[PDB]
Amino acid sequence: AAQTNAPWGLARISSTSPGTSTYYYDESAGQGSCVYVIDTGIEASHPEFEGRAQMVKTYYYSSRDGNGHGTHCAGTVGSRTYGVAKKTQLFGVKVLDDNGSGQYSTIIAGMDFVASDKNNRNCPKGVVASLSLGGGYSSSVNSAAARLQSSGVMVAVAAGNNNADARNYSPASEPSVCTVGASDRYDRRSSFSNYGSVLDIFGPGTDILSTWIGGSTRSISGTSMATPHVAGLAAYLMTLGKTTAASACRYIADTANKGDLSNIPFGTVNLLAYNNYQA
């Protein structure tokens, strides 16, 4: 399948070079997989989700995304026009308030929730969780991410936007999960992207067009935007049978575009998520 005039990030993950505009992907498109977006919620009624999104848990007064961030990330995972895995099932877990803030205790509860909830859902090709959030180091937050991964869910987390070593941020610094840095359309590390030995992979993160609340769209930047590209790619690969939840991060790193990025500090991987699609 080919989507012409795709958002640049989708084109990038299906090409060995920057500058293309077509997203090539297998028609299976993540069907049969499930991705939990743990964030400010998801506007499930957005036409771009085609009825494939639903809220399953909120830690606040409402399950509505009053912010937009969670809807944007979900859109990159799995919306028709802006998503990597266009037929996946999306579940929203609202652990961030409408200002995009949340306490560590709530974020941990949200991870433990998904570890249990996945047992109640029909996801034959596997389960992914996308966490476009983080804050200062916390061993308890890392431990929660490690448990989620251990339970059999492919966990992808944002490296953070401090232009710093991600070792000082959580859950980015938990080695067992897949920590995602951001790049721009010229294959440069995004100027805000954290880096360091704990990063596993890079994805498109600068100027990413996706869904927004009020049935709209908008372009924003962050490691928060790169993370759903990797989460969607994982869902897409599990559906194809190429990898499992336990090994998807390693498989993505193994099959990545290598050495294409500039401004990567010594000690940080130079690997860009790539779907290896061949028609």
Ligand SMILES: O=c1ccc2ccccc2o1
């Ligand atoms: O869009 C965002 C806003 C804040 C933030 C903080 C830590 C990690 C990722 C983040 O993404």
Ligand SMILES: [Ca+2]
């Ligand atoms: Ca290349």
Ligand SMILES: [Ca+2]
């Ligand atoms: Ca890792």
